[PDB]
mmCIF file of C-alpha atoms and ligand atoms in Angstrom:
data_model
loop_
_atom_site.group_PDB
_atom_site.id
_atom_site.type_symbol
_atom_site.label_atom_id
_atom_site.label_comp_id
_atom_site.label_asym_id
_atom_site.label_seq_id
_atom_site.Cartn_x
_atom_site.Cartn_y
_atom_site.Cartn_z
ATOM 1 C CA UNK F 19 35.429 -20.442 -14.767
ATOM 2 C CA UNK F 20 36.523 -23.774 -14.229
ATOM 3 C CA UNK F 21 38.957 -23.408 -17.122
ATOM 4 C CA UNK F 22 40.735 -20.512 -15.557
ATOM 5 C CA UNK F 23 42.855 -21.523 -12.570
ATOM 6 C CA UNK F 24 42.096 -20.309 -8.904
ATOM 7 C CA UNK F 25 43.741 -16.986 -8.491
ATOM 8 C CA UNK F 26 47.278 -16.510 -6.770
ATOM 9 C CA UNK F 27 46.821 -16.630 -2.872
ATOM 10 C CA UNK F 28 45.894 -13.627 -1.052
ATOM 11 C CA UNK F 29 44.927 -14.961 2.227
ATOM 12 C CA UNK F 30 46.908 -17.359 4.379
ATOM 13 C CA UNK F 31 46.499 -17.060 8.283
ATOM 14 C CA UNK F 32 49.656 -19.424 8.744
ATOM 15 C CA UNK F 33 52.117 -17.036 6.709
ATOM 16 C CA UNK F 34 53.814 -14.700 9.088
ATOM 17 C CA UNK F 35 53.091 -11.033 8.149
ATOM 18 C CA UNK F 36 54.939 -7.847 8.730
ATOM 19 C CA UNK F 37 54.345 -4.103 7.821
ATOM 20 C CA UNK F 38 57.533 -2.441 6.614
ATOM 21 C CA UNK F 39 58.246 1.106 5.441
ATOM 22 C CA UNK F 40 59.176 -0.399 2.239
ATOM 23 C CA UNK F 41 55.818 -2.307 1.822
ATOM 24 C CA UNK F 42 54.028 1.004 2.547
ATOM 25 C CA UNK F 43 56.062 2.863 -0.104
ATOM 26 C CA UNK F 44 54.995 -0.129 -2.577
ATOM 27 C CA UNK F 45 51.327 0.430 -1.833
ATOM 28 C CA UNK F 46 51.219 4.324 -1.415
ATOM 29 C CA UNK F 47 53.749 5.126 -4.134
ATOM 30 C CA UNK F 48 54.289 2.089 -6.416
ATOM 31 C CA UNK F 49 50.766 0.603 -6.657
ATOM 32 C CA UNK F 50 48.851 3.897 -6.573
ATOM 33 C CA UNK F 51 50.966 5.419 -9.551
ATOM 34 C CA UNK F 52 50.766 2.248 -11.749
ATOM 35 C CA UNK F 53 47.101 1.695 -11.092
ATOM 36 C CA UNK F 54 46.131 5.155 -12.470
ATOM 37 C CA UNK F 55 48.254 4.748 -15.652
ATOM 38 C CA UNK F 56 46.251 4.706 -19.052
ATOM 39 C CA UNK F 57 47.870 1.319 -19.650
ATOM 40 C CA UNK F 58 46.985 -0.339 -16.240
ATOM 41 C CA UNK F 59 43.534 -1.794 -16.982
ATOM 42 C CA UNK F 60 44.695 -5.243 -18.580
ATOM 43 C CA UNK F 61 46.806 -5.774 -15.429
ATOM 44 C CA UNK F 62 44.132 -4.831 -12.898
ATOM 45 C CA UNK F 63 42.966 -8.371 -12.529
ATOM 46 C CA UNK F 64 44.011 -11.893 -13.455
ATOM 47 C CA UNK F 65 44.136 -12.907 -17.288
ATOM 48 C CA UNK F 66 40.657 -14.250 -17.909
ATOM 49 C CA UNK F 67 41.990 -16.902 -20.484
ATOM 50 C CA UNK F 68 38.205 -17.968 -21.334
ATOM 51 C CA UNK F 69 36.993 -14.362 -21.718
ATOM 52 C CA UNK F 70 39.909 -13.463 -24.064
ATOM 53 C CA UNK F 71 40.182 -16.610 -26.040
ATOM 54 C CA UNK F 72 43.705 -17.457 -24.936
ATOM 55 C CA UNK F 73 43.016 -21.290 -24.209
ATOM 56 C CA UNK F 74 46.897 -21.909 -24.109
ATOM 57 C CA UNK F 75 47.411 -19.152 -21.679
ATOM 58 C CA UNK F 76 47.686 -21.166 -18.431
ATOM 59 C CA UNK F 77 49.544 -24.115 -20.330
ATOM 60 C CA UNK F 78 52.491 -21.446 -20.696
ATOM 61 C CA UNK F 79 51.901 -19.220 -17.618
ATOM 62 C CA UNK F 80 52.448 -21.216 -14.509
ATOM 63 C CA UNK F 81 53.090 -18.547 -12.067
ATOM 64 C CA UNK F 82 50.174 -15.981 -12.989
ATOM 65 C CA UNK F 83 50.254 -12.588 -11.356
ATOM 66 C CA UNK F 84 48.506 -9.332 -11.818
ATOM 67 C CA UNK F 85 48.048 -5.939 -10.133
ATOM 68 C CA UNK F 86 44.481 -6.819 -8.591
ATOM 69 C CA UNK F 87 46.170 -9.748 -6.611
ATOM 70 C CA UNK F 88 49.226 -7.276 -5.819
ATOM 71 C CA UNK F 89 46.658 -4.794 -4.549
ATOM 72 C CA UNK F 90 44.760 -7.409 -2.328
ATOM 73 C CA UNK F 91 48.194 -8.545 -1.000
ATOM 74 C CA UNK F 92 49.372 -5.067 -0.172
ATOM 75 C CA UNK F 93 46.100 -3.991 1.134
ATOM 76 C CA UNK F 94 45.145 -7.245 3.296
ATOM 77 C CA UNK F 95 48.742 -7.375 4.700
ATOM 78 C CA UNK F 96 50.015 -10.582 2.947
ATOM 79 C CA UNK F 97 53.753 -10.039 2.744
ATOM 80 C CA UNK F 98 56.756 -10.152 5.130
ATOM 81 C CA UNK F 99 58.929 -8.025 2.947
ATOM 82 C CA UNK F 100 59.254 -5.659 -0.161
ATOM 83 C CA UNK F 101 61.276 -8.219 -2.173
ATOM 84 C CA UNK F 102 58.170 -10.499 -2.249
ATOM 85 C CA UNK F 103 56.009 -7.694 -3.625
ATOM 86 C CA UNK F 104 58.756 -6.563 -6.051
ATOM 87 C CA UNK F 105 58.995 -10.243 -7.203
ATOM 88 C CA UNK F 106 55.162 -10.215 -7.796
ATOM 89 C CA UNK F 107 55.395 -7.174 -10.106
ATOM 90 C CA UNK F 108 58.441 -8.650 -11.773
ATOM 91 C CA UNK F 109 56.271 -11.943 -12.580
ATOM 92 C CA UNK F 110 53.535 -9.950 -13.887
ATOM 93 C CA UNK F 111 55.819 -8.212 -16.458
ATOM 94 C CA UNK F 112 57.868 -11.273 -17.351
ATOM 95 C CA UNK F 113 54.742 -13.334 -17.843
ATOM 96 C CA UNK F 114 53.551 -10.711 -20.238
ATOM 97 C CA UNK F 115 56.792 -10.839 -22.119
ATOM 98 C CA UNK F 116 56.954 -14.595 -22.420
ATOM 99 C CA UNK F 117 53.358 -15.144 -23.666
ATOM 100 C CA UNK F 118 53.112 -12.305 -26.134
ATOM 101 C CA UNK F 119 55.215 -11.286 -29.305
ATOM 102 C CA UNK F 120 57.680 -8.516 -28.797
ATOM 103 C CA UNK F 121 56.118 -5.279 -29.948
ATOM 104 C CA UNK F 122 52.533 -6.544 -29.401
ATOM 105 C CA UNK F 123 50.342 -3.708 -27.982
ATOM 106 C CA UNK F 124 49.953 -5.476 -24.511
ATOM 107 C CA UNK F 125 53.901 -5.701 -24.486
ATOM 108 C CA UNK F 126 54.352 -1.959 -24.859
ATOM 109 C CA UNK F 127 51.641 -1.408 -22.307
ATOM 110 C CA UNK F 128 53.645 -3.637 -19.816
ATOM 111 C CA UNK F 129 56.753 -1.884 -20.705
ATOM 112 C CA UNK F 130 55.293 1.536 -20.117
ATOM 113 C CA UNK F 131 54.098 0.248 -16.500
ATOM 114 C CA UNK F 132 57.626 -1.451 -16.001
ATOM 115 C CA UNK F 133 59.466 1.747 -16.863
ATOM 116 C CA UNK F 134 57.458 3.584 -14.286
ATOM 117 C CA UNK F 135 57.996 0.920 -11.849
ATOM 118 C CA UNK F 136 61.781 1.007 -12.202
ATOM 119 C CA UNK F 137 61.789 4.881 -11.888
ATOM 120 C CA UNK F 138 59.908 4.298 -8.315
ATOM 121 C CA UNK F 139 61.806 0.952 -7.295
ATOM 122 C CA UNK F 140 65.129 2.870 -7.826
ATOM 123 C CA UNK F 141 63.939 5.286 -4.927
ATOM 124 C CA UNK F 142 63.000 2.394 -2.715
ATOM 125 C CA UNK F 143 63.692 3.731 0.856
ATOM 126 C CA UNK F 144 66.036 1.870 3.290
ATOM 127 C CA UNK F 145 64.307 0.043 6.222
ATOM 128 C CA UNK F 146 63.462 1.910 9.553
HETATM 129 C C1 GUJ Y 1 42.393 -7.670 -21.285
HETATM 130 C C2 GUJ Y 1 43.767 -8.401 -22.033
HETATM 131 S S1 GUJ Y 1 44.850 -8.972 -20.714
HETATM 132 C C3 GUJ Y 1 45.841 -9.528 -22.030
HETATM 133 C C4 GUJ Y 1 45.372 -8.980 -23.333
HETATM 134 C C5 GUJ Y 1 44.387 -8.469 -23.149
HETATM 135 C C6 GUJ Y 1 43.525 -7.766 -24.445
HETATM 136 C C7 GUJ Y 1 44.304 -6.672 -24.996
HETATM 137 C C8 GUJ Y 1 44.699 -6.479 -26.227
HETATM 138 C C9 GUJ Y 1 45.355 -5.404 -26.778
HETATM 139 C C10 GUJ Y 1 45.696 -4.464 -25.960
HETATM 140 C C11 GUJ Y 1 45.424 -4.462 -24.707
HETATM 141 C C12 GUJ Y 1 44.497 -5.670 -24.065
HETATM 142 C C13 GUJ Y 1 46.145 -9.313 -24.515
HETATM 143 O O1 GUJ Y 1 47.358 -10.133 -24.612
HETATM 144 C C14 GUJ Y 1 47.381 -11.349 -23.943
HETATM 145 C C15 GUJ Y 1 47.788 -10.972 -22.477
HETATM 146 N N1 GUJ Y 1 48.970 -11.506 -21.897
HETATM 147 N N2 GUJ Y 1 48.986 -10.571 -20.759
HETATM 148 C C16 GUJ Y 1 47.960 -10.049 -20.540
HETATM 149 C C17 GUJ Y 1 47.786 -8.995 -19.495
HETATM 150 N N3 GUJ Y 1 47.245 -10.169 -21.769
#
């Protein structure tokens, strides 16, 4: 839809790429575990503001992010470091908290994914 923005970048041949043990941990452990969570489905693809009748969404959220985009960035090696990927997850959670009312169902769902995310990120291995 023309009323939805293009998705966040997932392919850019000019951007340097690098595989790190931390990035492998983010795909194998963090993304894998969050993706199967009962509350993951609203976060598995960009917010479709047209379909969901949220016409102001992209007037408020200027740095959209979702796990579908993160999954593509991890599987198609878009990142140089783990911090870029962790920032994407944090952007996804923050966008949800900014747009929605505290205590809304979608906020409780993002909070459950973030609690699981924090448990996994505290165990982030050191580089090798
Ligand atoms: C499919 C989506 S994606 C989404 C929402 C829905 C519908 C919905 C409603 C209640 C419970 C679960 C899902 C609803 O809140 C707006 C919003 N802000 N960030 C996100 C992600 N969303």
